[PDB]
Amino acid sequence: THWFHRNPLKATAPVSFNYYGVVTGPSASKICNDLRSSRARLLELFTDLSCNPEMMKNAADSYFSLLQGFINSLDESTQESKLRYIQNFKWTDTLQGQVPSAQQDAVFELISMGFNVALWYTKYASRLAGKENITEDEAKEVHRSLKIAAGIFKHLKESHLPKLITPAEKGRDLESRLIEAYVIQCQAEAQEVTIARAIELKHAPGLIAALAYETANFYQKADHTLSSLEPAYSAKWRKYLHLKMCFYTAYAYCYHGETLLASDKCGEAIRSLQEAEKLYAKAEALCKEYGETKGPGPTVKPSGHLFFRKLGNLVKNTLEKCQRENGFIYFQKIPTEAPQLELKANYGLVEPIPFEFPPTSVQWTPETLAAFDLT
């Protein structure tokens, strides 16, 4: 069963979109009511455990198609919307606890809400990934959800962050590096699901070894991305990434050893299996430092060792094959160093699904927009 660390959802101040005098005429007034309601509904859905990706997709597009009117021009004879600065938006952040941040920009709202949707996808994903039975249909769903979240994060980062007038404090979700980390964790996580599938389907060891190794590199890269932050808020997360890295380095060594065995290198294979078991033991160390490290989001546990099942199988086959050469329980002619892994994964690597916001709601007409009078 899967274990994925999760930081808490962002929270936001209620927005009524009630502008009083600024609003003149029924058209502009109804569009403000629909903004109010479509935002409220989307926010309610975040904490709803009966929410699936169909409902979230609908609610999000409804709200975003309206919100877009505060951002993009209609006739496009104007740079942007005149309402972009009308409203102050306040959001908490995944690592920052109860200390919120506020900007009066519609873009900040767009990015923050969109960031929370992606977040919601990773949570729906891990909620499902943690169930026991876990049919194949549910696995695609988890895999797909994680890739959708990736696309949203990536899109927000490249096509949106630059538009902001106010750069976010380092350590906030709207900082570029933080978003890159979320992208990479989403890919790494989707690949975990593919690794479990590859293993139950009994694919080639080299394929699984390459995928495990590439996955550990993503975690290492995500960790390197969060390295530029402050230890107080970012420490727990980074420990989890380091832990994952040990977990999947241990898998790579396990399945590499089967490769070395099939090529009749007994000493090298033995050494490589020893490394797998060592790394996994150190991974069980880092696991406790992780559970004892103060930081945002609850602590998760691996349990569930399918590793020792494979290892026991490799060991018996290796000892039967390699004894009379390297020895029975006391091993001779073993390389002093573990093999240095360079592995290319040709199968299983995950791309984020390209994402785009819906086009501005047709409910935004020049007449409606004109009924907004700022003075």
């Binding site: 695609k140 895999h143 599938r197 590859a198 040709n346 199968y347």
Partner: peptide, 17 residues
């Protein structure tokens, strides 16, 4: 679905066998 080398692949990107 096939990859660039013409290998049949599944939903998860693994070789379809």
């Amino acid at each position: 679905t096939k990859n660039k080398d013409g290998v049949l692949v599944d939903e998860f990107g693994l070789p379809q066998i």
